[PDB]
User: Fold this.
Amino acid sequence: VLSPADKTNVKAAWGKVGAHAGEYGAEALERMFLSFPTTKTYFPHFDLSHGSAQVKGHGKKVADALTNAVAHVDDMPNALSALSDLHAHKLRVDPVNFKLLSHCLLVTLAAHLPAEFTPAVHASLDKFLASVSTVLTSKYR
Amino acid sequence: VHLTPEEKSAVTALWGKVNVDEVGGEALGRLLVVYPWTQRFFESFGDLSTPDAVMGNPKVKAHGKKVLGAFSDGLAHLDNLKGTFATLSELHCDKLHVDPENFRLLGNVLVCVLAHHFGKEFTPPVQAAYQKVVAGVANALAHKYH
Amino acid sequence: PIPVLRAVDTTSPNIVADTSTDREQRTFATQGGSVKPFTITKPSPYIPGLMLTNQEILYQAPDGKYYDFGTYNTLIMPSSSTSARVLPNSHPMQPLDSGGKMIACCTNQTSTGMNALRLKSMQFGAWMSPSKTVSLFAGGTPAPTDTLQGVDTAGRPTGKATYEVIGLRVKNDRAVTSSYETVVTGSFLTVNFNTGKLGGTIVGNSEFGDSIEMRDVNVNGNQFSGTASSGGHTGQVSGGLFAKEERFYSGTLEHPSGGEIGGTVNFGSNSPLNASFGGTRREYNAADTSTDTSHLV
Ligand code: HEM
Ligand code: HEM
Assistant:
């Protein structure tokens, strides 16, 4: 459960990402695929090499979805229903994979936002990402 | 842990810039702030009620120094982490009963602290290398549960 | 007692001077001295039998000798006990083999809390001769003008940027520094790329002496120069923007060049008022249309 502090911390930090969100998105995916190569199994016919436009494209989708989450931080179950359909109903992603990508997003954010990635903000981003994850991994139709 | 030449030089080149009196206290501090139940293991350290309190707790900083010390030790013995960490594994598992999930969590907060300090030098392959190290350490520290 | 710093032997096959155009260093110095690019191959203290090769910078003093940046020739690191950080206003210089003394801003090691000490593409400080004359300096990787802020859109620099800096003098065989506290108290310089001007004040104290106020300073590409004043004297400002642009690992532009800044202020031949300074970009905005040097907040 996010605190009120947690919500503003997440809005502020993610607000700073601005129109580089697709780049943060793609870098977190690249970090995931390299650090944890079992995660690649979910993308069986992607090009997952260093340059890949496909990873880039996908990263922007992920990053935009998170921006949508941040904008609807109070009612994420309703906001993210279609993505829960995809990840829990269709794809059946093991939740461990969401911890892996969440960790990689945190690392991406630490590397690019060193003023903003304080201990308190790190704490909120982690809680936020865990909450997003829970929603995308739940069947609640 | 097998590191590649490129990986190994990358890890060590970054490790060389780590301020060994501060970075350990940082990582431990973030553990206590991001995963607050870990505070219970350090009830003896006094005020941990606040992120600033935590991060400025001199016993946190002191104790962090020792945990980084152990990771530094680890870097010289990547091929015998279990042996090297045997005494510590007994302390943490048999005596404190730390849930081993928390060893993985600290490994990961340390990785976040590295990236925080080194920014664009903490490239995806450099991270992947550090993941192998922190996973090695956590598993070695958990050995007595296995 | 502080140990004696011995000159680096650049004759070693481990230390090899860097003649690439992209590693070209620029230095502003009251009485000579320059920062100089090397590739340096050294063993790791953490894994034996390794040799690590990295790009680095050394300081060449006026007497011709080269020095590295280490614990003892850099500004006392502020204490970490509280959330708060104070920079001590007075610091010892490190005695050299030559008779001289040295101070510089920072090492390449990690730290927290005080951004103006976390320089990655430049150094500043002072060298004192065996004769007690001082050459103050500031030097580094100049900010390539093709990737200054506004250039992507407008083909020339545009907007404003605001930097947080520390000034340094030498007084009584000690390095003395402008007031710096976490900001709570610091020194801010703002570049206006619309007008080509630089404004701001290096805030003095008991030890540093009087503040240095930027009076009329013009900016052109990645250089600036002009006048400052301090305690009714006029000094000459010379300086530059530093640091290459920052890119995402994709190659896309993340931050423009010139994320660091530095210079000297010269009040007179061997005047003890003479200063170096350096610092880091705290806010920028290419689409700013303001025509003054008021600070970004
Ligand atoms: C913050 C976490 C995540 C977010 C916000 C997210 C978001 C999305 C979005 C927006 C899409 C595309 C839906 C569309 O096309 O409109 C998508 C597709 C996908 N996601 Fe996720 N996702 C996340 C985590 C994961 C993880 C951890 C995995 C697997 C390891 C995963 C696997 C996939 C796959 C396989 C697709 C479909 C790609 C295809 O077309 O083949 N996702 N995700
Ligand atoms: C890889 C992770 C870790 C490493 C390398 C590590 C290392 C160490 C080291 C070197 C000591 C000092 C023991 C001595 O002086 O002989 C220690 C003590 C301790 N560790 Fe850890 N540790 C880790 C993770 C954890 C975690 C996750 C917790 C709790 C959540 C924890 C709780 C403690 C406690 C409570 C002590 C106190 C011992 C005492 O006060 O007598 N450690 N650890």
